[PDB]
Every structure is written in C-alpha cells, then in structure tokens.
Amino acid sequence: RDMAVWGRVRSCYKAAPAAKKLDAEMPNTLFGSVALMYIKQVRRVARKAVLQRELAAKLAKAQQDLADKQAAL
C-alpha cells in the first residue's frame, strides 16, 4: 500500500454513511457495499503480502547462513 494514495482513500472511505443508505441508494445491485468489500480485501491482502515479504526474507537469510556454515566446515 502507498500511504499518500491510501490516506486519500481512507478519508473518502470513512465519510461513507451507514450501510442502510448505501443499500437504499441502488437496491438493484448494491454497488457501494461491494466496493467497500473490495477496498477492505485489497487492504488485508496487502498486509498479509508484506508479512510474506518479511518472512521470506528471513527464510532466505536462514538458507544463506546455513550454506555459509556448511562451507565453513
């Protein structure tokens, strides 16, 4: 996530009304709720992805220093 383009989306997000308004707006296809769900899923997937990046870097370091230990012996 980029903070500059995510502060703006947080601002435009928190200003949304309750779910009743977003339901009564377009009863045919609840576009507003679905867009909210998309935003939430993007946020959470990004968070777990950065967690993956960190843990994979740790695993790469573990492989590297295991190889170094093998080379030392």
Add this chain to the structure above:
Amino acid sequence: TSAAEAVEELKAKVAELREQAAAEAAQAAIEKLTAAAEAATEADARAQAAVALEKQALDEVVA
C-alpha cells in the same frame, strides 16, 4: 430486481474464507540451525498459502 440474497451468499463465503485465512495467519549446531531453517520454510509455506487463499477471496468478490 433486488440483490437481496447474492450479497448474502457472498458474505457467507467471504467470511468463512477470511476465518480460514486467519486460522493459518499464526557440527551439532549445524543440525540445529538446519532444523530452524526447516521450521522457517514451513512457516513461509503456511503463510504463503494463507495469502493465496485471501487473494482468491478478493478475486471472488471482484467476480
């Protein structure tokens, strides 16, 4: 037309899958650190599975 149910099944599926993803969210020294590297690999695989599952949930919402 009313989108009364389809949202409901979407909510049920995405909530169950979010719960499942959250479930997986959580010379002798040479051998010990080899075991540590194996544990790190296992954690990496589990967390990658979790993130792939959540990406699938996002794609379901988009679909």
